[PDB]
Amino acid sequence: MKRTFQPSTLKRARVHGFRARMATKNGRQVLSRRRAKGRKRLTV
Amino acid sequence: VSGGGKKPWRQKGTGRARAGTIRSPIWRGGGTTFAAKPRSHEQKLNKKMYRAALRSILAELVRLDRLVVVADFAVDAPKTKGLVAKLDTLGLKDVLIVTDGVDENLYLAARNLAHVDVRDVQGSDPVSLIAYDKVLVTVSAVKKFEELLG
Amino acid sequence: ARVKRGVIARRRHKKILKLAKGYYGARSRVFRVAKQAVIKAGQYAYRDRRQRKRQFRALWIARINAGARQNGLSYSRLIAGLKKAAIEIDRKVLADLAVNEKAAFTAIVEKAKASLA
RNA sequence: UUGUCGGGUAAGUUCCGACCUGCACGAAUGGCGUAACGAUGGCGGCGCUGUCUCCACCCGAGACUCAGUGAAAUUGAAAUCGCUGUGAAGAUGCAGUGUAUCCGCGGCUAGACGGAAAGACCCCGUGAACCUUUACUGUAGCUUUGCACUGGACUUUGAG
RNA sequence: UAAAAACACAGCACUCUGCAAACACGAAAGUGGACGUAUAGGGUGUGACGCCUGCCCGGUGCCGGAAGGUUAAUUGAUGGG
RNA sequence: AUGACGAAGUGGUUGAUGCCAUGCUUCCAAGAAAAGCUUCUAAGCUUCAGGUAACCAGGAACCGUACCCCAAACCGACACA
RNA sequence: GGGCUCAAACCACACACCGAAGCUGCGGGUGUCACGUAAGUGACGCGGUAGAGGAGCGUUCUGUAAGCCUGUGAAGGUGAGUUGAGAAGCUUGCUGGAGGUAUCAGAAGUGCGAAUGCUGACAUGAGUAACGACAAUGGGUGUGAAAAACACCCACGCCGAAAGACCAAGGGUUCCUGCGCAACGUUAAUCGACGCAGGGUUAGUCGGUUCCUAAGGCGAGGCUGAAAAGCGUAGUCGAUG
RNA sequence: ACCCACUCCCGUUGAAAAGGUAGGGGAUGACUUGUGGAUCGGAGUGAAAGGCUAAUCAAGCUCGGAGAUAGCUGGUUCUCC
């Protein structure tokens, strides 16, 4: 049974990484929200 | 309370009691049902109601011998030892001193005394007139009391 | 401002469980089971203050019947005789005589027999 | 309506052929046929058989016992029998009566209206959603004309 | 929990579209259609093949016409204050 | 493990889905791009620079590299048929 | 129900008795009226859901309280006794080891058994089901506190287009050695993908990086859009090539 | 092989939140498959089942409006008169 998580660190980086978030304005909002909450990890 | 936006599980089917938030006041760590906010507790007292209570207190203090009237009450230096000597001549230990004008030296001398309070006529609240064992009042403050309450 | 219920609640629950002493199983250990047992025992106790008076009178009357039939009278005829001859000894004392003082009980029965006829 | 007739069977509400009385077929929401094809629907046959008459024996794996580890749903509390009545109307618990020493283990599922999911059917709420339309009221879009951007000239066109 | 007789299909037909196409996504710019150009592209229905596909234009839609009636914004004659 | 020696080590046949082969034939549905590479010149450069060939000398940086990988180490909450 | 028939049935009459929380007796409490300017007497009352009215207990905090109690033992906990109509109060043994609070007021996060309530702990089921492919084990020896499972030896059995060997992805130290076994391992464990410590990965040629581009991304200016932005030219990235 | 999923049985607190054994279909194609990329919430994608869009679909998830509203169900805690 193939499950939903098929890991690919390259795909993970390009969809959820720091530069993917910084590229847009809503992505920068995620980083602002996660900095304001104090998340130790900011992106993945 | 922090969080609690999401419904913890679907309304039907899980067998649990239905829950809308994990911050229900029913839940541990949830909201206080009727959480307090900073509020004011001061009642309104009519001006004449306040004065009538002061008149009752002053009349009762005279009837109970708890009012001591002296011609004047002044200390020379702001020394607590000096005030203790003065109040011991009058035989007073727990006493509220009421003067027409609170002396600067008198205020300093009574500041550290355990059961001694010095107040202006305007500062003589109903609570302090009742709490203190004796109310030593100068003749000037007696007359100033008469103008205010009569 | 904030009032903890622990001390007062423990005192309440302990009073109930102390009253449930001697009860079986959860009726002496578990508060919400012991609470029902203490209430029901109270309902019974109130009702059995009434029933005790009935039970003892039925016991006196049965012993008076047995004692009087040993003397040639039924209970109903003895009570009627004890009213014709104005004897106001009640059934508790009469049942005590019929067991413990049989000569005294015989004298009363003879006094009832004479009164009837 | 299992229409009627014929065939197939000892016997066929199914099947195949036919009749036409088509409740209520019918011609590109196609009509009628059709070789090949189909893990497609129906029916018949040969073979084959434990499908069955009717089950027997055997072989492994559980079940069972010992040693080690060690869940679950459920659960108001239980000292938790039958029957006939009664009863919020189908009783382990009420009444009467019968039976019945105390406690396991292997089995079986008749009941505990057994467990599981605040019935989905049904009705209700001046509940929801999504769907439809010649329901209402709107609206994107498409379209009509006026005015603006927007001008010159010549000609068919009313009154001053 | 449905693999089918459902969907698709080759073939068929109707209809739209002259290219800055119709049509679609986009407040728009632009993009697809298509670096295609009616033997092409879109939409609709039917569904190899064989024989065929009858009658009805009243209703609704669509197409064409414009004599008449009605009809928007607009304009503002006239009357009454 | 320890350190020296160490014989034979040749023919026949069979033979790939591997290589020739990015070949050949055939078909229709008509089958990446760019650079490296070769060559030609323009602007420039003209004793130069640059190019070519020979010889000599030297260099080739940085990151990964264990281990599992039809699995008990990955995706399945598990040392999960 | 047992049983019943000159009845223990039916009809009539009579005298007895039983029988309720009804009535009476005795003792107590309470409501309302009246007399009382009193303590109290008198009369009549006193089942109760929804609901109205009245009167209280207790808990935490503030004042009274720089008081009072308290290591000669506070709060809390756990027994006993006792008082009141009740919520409850008081005294005391033991435990506990530093706080508590009279009285009268004032403020409330003020009283829990239910909400398929929330959190934690612990039961019942029950020492029950299960111990995860039916490829399979037997013995000997060693070590060890202890061996069916660890190591070795002799046998047996299983896979072998894999259950063998690799590359990629993914993981990240699981690799090897010494020590170790609490927990982890569905049992035990001396063994381990487990714990502690140390060690181990060496490149001009392998794979990346670097060069080049595909889809696609971003995109100076630019065009468009209330804003945020959208699109896209020059370019610049982007392998799966 | 690989992809698939027609039948029975098992399993249904499973070895497994869809499997296994035995049979079954396609297996040069409208085939299967890796890597990378594009399209998404009244939106996408759909050989069309209202299918699929991270075990969630007649309008995903997440946070906010938000303590929506609930003429409905449940619950509502000491004492006495």
Place this chain on the structure above:
RNA sequence: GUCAAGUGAAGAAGCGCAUACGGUGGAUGCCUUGGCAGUCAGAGGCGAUGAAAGACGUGGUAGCCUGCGAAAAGCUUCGGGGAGUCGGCAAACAGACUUUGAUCCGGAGAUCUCUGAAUGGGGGAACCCACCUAGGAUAACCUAGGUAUCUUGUACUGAAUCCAUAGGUGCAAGAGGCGAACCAGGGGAACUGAAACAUCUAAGUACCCUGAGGAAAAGAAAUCAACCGAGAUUCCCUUAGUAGUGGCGAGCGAACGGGGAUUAGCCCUUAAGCUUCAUUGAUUUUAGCGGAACGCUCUGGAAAGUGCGGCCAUAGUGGGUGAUAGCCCCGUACGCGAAAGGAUCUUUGAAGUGAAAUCGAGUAGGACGGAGCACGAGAAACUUUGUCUGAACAUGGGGGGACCAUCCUCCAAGGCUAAAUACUACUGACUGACCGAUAGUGAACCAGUACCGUGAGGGAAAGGCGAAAAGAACCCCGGAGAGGGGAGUGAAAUAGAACCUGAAACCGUAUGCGUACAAGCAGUGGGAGCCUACUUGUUAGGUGACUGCGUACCUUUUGUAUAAUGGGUCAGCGACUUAUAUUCAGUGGCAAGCUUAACCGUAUAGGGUAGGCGUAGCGAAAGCGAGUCUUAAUAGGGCGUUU
């Protein structure tokens, strides 16, 4: 003695109740490391001189936190300070430093890897690849600086195209990003309410976006008023839930006037201001210094508590110290203190700006369609503008809520302007009839962590030995275990590290009684026996044979043992609150009067009487008035008047 009949204890596999002692668990009490809410101040920003936020490093020894940055728990210097020190978890050994003044605290400097607006180019953040200049090495490099884009300005060049322009290159200045709220503006829902729903409401709210500042905005009448006058703006209280608005439904909701807080006006014949740089003095902030006064005695492990006797106080309800301390310590009142930096007021000076130039024309007005004004088209003034038009020039123009006339009042189409006002992510102090570990922050503890999720995001649990580790030397059993038994420490070890107290469920061991012919809410009434203890039987406690009666509780219902609902049990938590308006009652103050709001106030006082209610009603209203309204009516009748 035999037989027969009758009667019959004790012998419990297990179980029940009670009691005692444990176990599990972690309630309760007490406590605080941390929170919550205010009050008074401060600061109101940080960033291309590289921020917020991080990654990786940095120590004698592993990790993590804190600090710091290859100069890396730190370097230089100036002050404070005066004996210890080498940060914490969390110590152990090492090696050292320090009265040649260390550690520590404060000011100023230096260094400051890599990522991140990230800015040389690229990128999967913390990585990869460069170029230019200058210097120095001969090999395969090293040091220092520069190299983003856009805006503004400037210089040089420069097409189609002759002059130009567009463009290109250099230089200088600036910007970009982050931050809880407050402000201005652009876009703008729905649920909900209307007991349905569409106008309407929710609401110009939530949210998204932009810009600015410590505040912002507004602001000096083309404003109200009403024939009297007021005199910018902003904010508070009233007027008043009134006028009005509204499927005249649900709702929405002024102004005039009045009381206050603040007060300020200046220019376009160019100013008040504001900014920057000097500059004169005042404070203030960022380290610190001194700071009073107590003994004996009893209990006790320990005294601060008991008893007795003193002293200080401008310092007395602070925190600790072996129990409760004015006098033991640290502090407190009070008085001093700055080498250096920051800030705020000021006195002058300098430029810069305000600055739009020169009194306002595509403007006022108008038509259409919207929006706003409390005002939903209404009889609809006024503001504003998407489309379209379009004046006059103080002998003029705007407004006064359709509109006209008269009167009054103002001068739009140019600007700048403090205070009173809003907010608190941040820093300090003070405070609380706030919490006290299920509370209070989600977070008292290495918490936005673990963990869950692809991701956005969601999101825990977990505090306490003792006064002091004095943390149990040594002996014994045991596997050189785990765990115990002694010994010892300690006041106490059943305070032994999962450690204060130590509840309940739940699980045991011991003892007493009961229990194997017996039917059911498990009790209650009666009641034998046995056991225990003294009070020795009219007693207390435990058990309880046998027997009468007896179908839990909650909820919901006409009605429930119901086979209707809910609960496995325990412990903790868990539901009528609060604000603002208001009516009635009770209880007070004052009384034909009563009471203030904002606000002021060395501030619960006192002032403030604007306002509200009352003392008069009737009428739709003008109005009249102990009457009034209806009506022809002074008649009748309605309401009112005798408190």
